[PDB]
Symmetry: D2
Subunit: 209 residues, 4 copies
């Protein structure tokens, strides 16, 4: 039965042939330089390929995907992506997308040791501690969704606790957005993700350099 790696390289050649036949200017024009307007921070989960689920093309979405779309404030991996997207490509939108049935969110609600995943998941366990009574009042499936939403909202806070982001929000109206992707339906939903404007004033004072 088929080697999925070999099958993928053959499907890549078919995709390159389709590009050459249907849109022969697209890839050569993108090779001159990318100009995406969107930074996507989402989960590595194979069911959440940003460009496919958004109905977009190569060149549209600058992408970071990690376990459970977690923003550790001092993580160089997300830190370097955000610096490059915001300062160098000047994206207009930063999207943090969580998803239903997230294995990283579910791991954080369990109490099994998962080796190197344990430090990675600490931010999710911090949210679990802070919201423990609320999460215990929900079904397992509702708790995984609620913690996924709380994680997206906390990530948007962490994202704005960066001078490069606050500068872009003041200079060009950079927007930040929280989404949940429903792996069962294919639909994205927006999170309210409200903060008092008081919140951003304190953050500006505390973080702009």
């Amino acid at each position: 039965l088929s080697d999925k790696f070999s099958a993928a390289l053959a499907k890549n050649k078919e995709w390159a042939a389709k590009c050459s036949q249907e849109h022969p200017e697209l890839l050569p024009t993108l090779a001159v330089g990318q100009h995406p307007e969107i930074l996507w921070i989402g989960c590595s989960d194979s069911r959440c390929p940003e460009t496919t689920i958004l109905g977009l093309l190569p060149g549209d979405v600058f992408t970071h995907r990690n376990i459970a779309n977690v923003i550790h404030p001092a993580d160089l991996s997300s830190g370097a992506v955000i610096e490059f997207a915001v300062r160098h490509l000047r994206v207009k939108h930063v999207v943090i997308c969580g998803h239903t049935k997230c294995g990283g969110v579910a791991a954080a609600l369990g109490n099994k040791g998962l080796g190197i995943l344990d430090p990675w998941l600490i931010p999710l366990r911090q949210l679990r501690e802070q919201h423990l009574a609320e999460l215990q009042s929900l079904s397992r499936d509702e708790a995984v969704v609620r913690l996924a939403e709380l994680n997206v909202k906390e990530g948007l806070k962490a994202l704005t606790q960066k001078s490069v982001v606050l500068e872009a929000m003041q200079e060009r109206g950079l927007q930040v957005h929280g989404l949940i992707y429903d792996v069962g339906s294919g639909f994205l939903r927006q999170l309210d993700a409200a903060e008092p404007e008081e919140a951003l004033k304190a953050r500006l004072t505390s973080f702009k350099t």
Copy 2:
């Protein structure tokens, strides 16, 4: 507004998926079973699922600046642990690309703030291969250092007990590619190491 345009295109895409693959999304909701972990660049021109002609559920994905594997990076570390031990992917692919902004940054000497520590592995390869890279044009050096970065990434990937375990226990394979953003073609890298190399790595890294 590209954000509101993308949400409208998402709804259209999800509706079309329900009509043209009616079993896909409901079966994916039960559980993912991807056979491939892709480690690639965040570059907007390298969306793994589209360039491979695949579907949602096929590729477990990590994308960062210049597809760099720092040995002790928890972000790539956690992805590799989850993909290899929990999802049991059969393939790990590191994919570099032509016209990589991270590779180009590393060949320059401009300070880029938080990017500077991130790009150290590329500058280590630049130092190690300095005569070879200086013998090339800037455009040729950006390709060459992209290739050297993929090959070094495959070494870093295999200096992990979780990977070495899966290679011996269940035949996990690792692969290096370069994506040409101008042609849409993936090229396989030779990425040769003597078998002697994996023996010393097993001794040095595999834990009980």
Copy 3:
């Protein structure tokens, strides 16, 4: 003659001579194996050498020192020290020691960009944002002290959001302590670092493996 490095190697040999003369069994007995009962997490600040300011000897204090004694939850540097000290050496005490006139705490209350220090100092700026009204109500010098104390208390919280620490606290009565070192007087003062008992219960539920 002015070279502090060569002067330090000469003073090292004088110190080795003093050990051989005054306590000839000490270093050979320590060479058999270390048994410190204290893990110290302090600032790199040259004024805070733990073994000297505690009046202790080599072998007494397992030590981590970093900029402003910051505990990033997912930092492998502090993570590995804590794992080794708590699980393998079985220390009885973990001390987080902040200090007066901390340059890292002062940096976090300023708005100058300090390159690679910026991500490192984010937890201090998070405390600044959370306590902004309180810190703005104080003099510059009082704010530097207050933020230094808030940083030690936040570090003790981060330290207990680790299964290895919670396990040792329950199984063998490991204790954790917050101190401030006054660089001008040489005195250590203890911080209260009391938590509502609800807090510790939720942390056990949320973090113990």
Copy 4:
């Protein structure tokens, strides 16, 4: 017991310091001017200020498991930036030591949880030098890998623009030591590199 005993000994030490160095604490109350950055092991037997016969204010200090320099580690990165750029230390010392638990862990094949990613650089040196280390006794291998770790750390330390700038601008020096926990003596390591090596590093790492 030992915690309350240490607080009482602290007060006695501060009282004795006021009598035997009456200018020291009042000068330190206002600031610090150490000329040395020490990067050493957390090992309780390697307290830098004590083994150097120095005082508070003399040694800006970073201690971690096995004195490992991960190139992109923000913990060591932030210390080096602060010491070199802001305090303008004249010397950076990396000190390894005999009977190092982290070095010994890297030569074993037991899984140690969060220590495993931390110890990768030691296992990379073990792989690179495997034949040489297998030719030695356990005790000789622990010393040899400790020395290889100090030398690799000095390379990582100099692959930083802040260090290279200080070396060129103000003659910052870097030094590798091994501390013998049994004798109390520091030994200097030869730590030779072709001058060719530092030139390629300057080209590859110094920001304009």
